[PDB]
Design a protein around this ligand. Structure first.
Ligand SMILES: C=CC1=C(C)/C(=C/c2[nH]c(/C=C3N=C(/C=C4\NC(=O)C(C)=C4C=C)C(C)=C\3CCC(=O)O)c(CCC(=O)O)c2C)NC1=O
Length: 243
């Protein structure tokens, strides 16, 4: 988890480096246990007719978080990617923390982060709404509109092309704030009823089914590994549907 053993870290975009470190720092003192990904995946690389894709995976769990997945990736020399989801244990009804940063030699092209709902009413729990509203509306110059499958994201979702260093840092600090709120709520969360647990499970299943519609992610995987490998990776590794 220190990321000192990461082969990719030294070479990734600096915003991706700071976010990876912030996430790792948020997790470091938790009652972590390993989470074995399919085939006990760690590092993986592939190439077909174009550029190589290299991926590093770290994954944990705690009693509140079913699966805590931090992934770093690079395609050839251009394209750097950070992907992170904290999948909640439905028993506790926490939202889904998620982040995706994509960067090229021209800087960060996409920075996305959210705490996504799992309630059937599509709202975050009241304590989250309150804490998030207190952060205030962050100003970013270059907002990006979510695709239709993006209905899963909350009203606090960030999706921008950072314009400059000030904005990169403002985005990273907002992610730190989201992680601080989320880790705090995890300690105050009580186990829920069977009907509420079920309702939260359904929201997490929906979230994964929608995230699988991301053709931008799927194309990157397909270009290095092929269609069948990409379908397995998106459905079993990135956005597994619980059951
Ligand atoms: C191997 C992993 C992995 C890869 C290969 C990947 C690729 C990837 N995701 C993208 C966008 C995107 N990614 C997301 C969102 C997310 N994606 C997530 O994995 C999570 C957790 C969220 C949100 C919290 C969204 C909303 C877009 C834009 C999709 C579109 O523009 O149609 C893009 C286009 C970036 C851009 O337009 O500037 C690429 C190349 N993302 C990854 O995670």
């Amino acid at each position: 988890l220190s990321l000192t053993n990461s082969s990719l870290m030294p070479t990734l975009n600096p915003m991706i480096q700071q976010l990876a470190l912030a996430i790792a720092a948020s997790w470091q003192s938790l009652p972590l246990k390993p989470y074995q990904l399919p085939e006990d995946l760690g590092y993986v690389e592939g190439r077909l007719e174009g550029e190589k894709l290299v991926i590093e995976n770290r994954c944990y769990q705690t009693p509140q978080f079913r699966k805590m997945h931090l992934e770093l990736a690079k395609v050839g020399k251009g394209l750097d990617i950070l992907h992170c989801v904290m999948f909640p244990e439905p028993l506790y009804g926490l939202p889904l923390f998620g982040c995706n940063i994509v960067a090229g030699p021209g800087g960060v092209s996409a920075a996305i982060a959210d705490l996504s709902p799992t309630q059937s009413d599509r709202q975050l729990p009241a304590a989250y709404q309150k804490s998030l509203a207190e952060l205030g509306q962050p100003e970013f110059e270059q907002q990006r509109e979510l695709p239709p499958w993006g209905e899963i994201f909350s009203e606090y979702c960030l999706f921008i092309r950072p314009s400059n260093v000030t904005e990169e840092e403002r985005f990273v600090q907002r992610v730190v704030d989201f992680l601080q709120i989320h880790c705090h709520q995890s300690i105050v969360a009580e186990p829920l009823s069977e009907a509420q647990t079920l309702e939260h499970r359904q929201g997490q299943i929906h979230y994964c089914q929608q995230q699988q519609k991301n053709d931008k992610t799927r194309r990157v995987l397909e270009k290095a590994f092929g269609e069948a490998w990409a379908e397995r990776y998106m459905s079993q590794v990135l956005f597994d549907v619980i059951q």
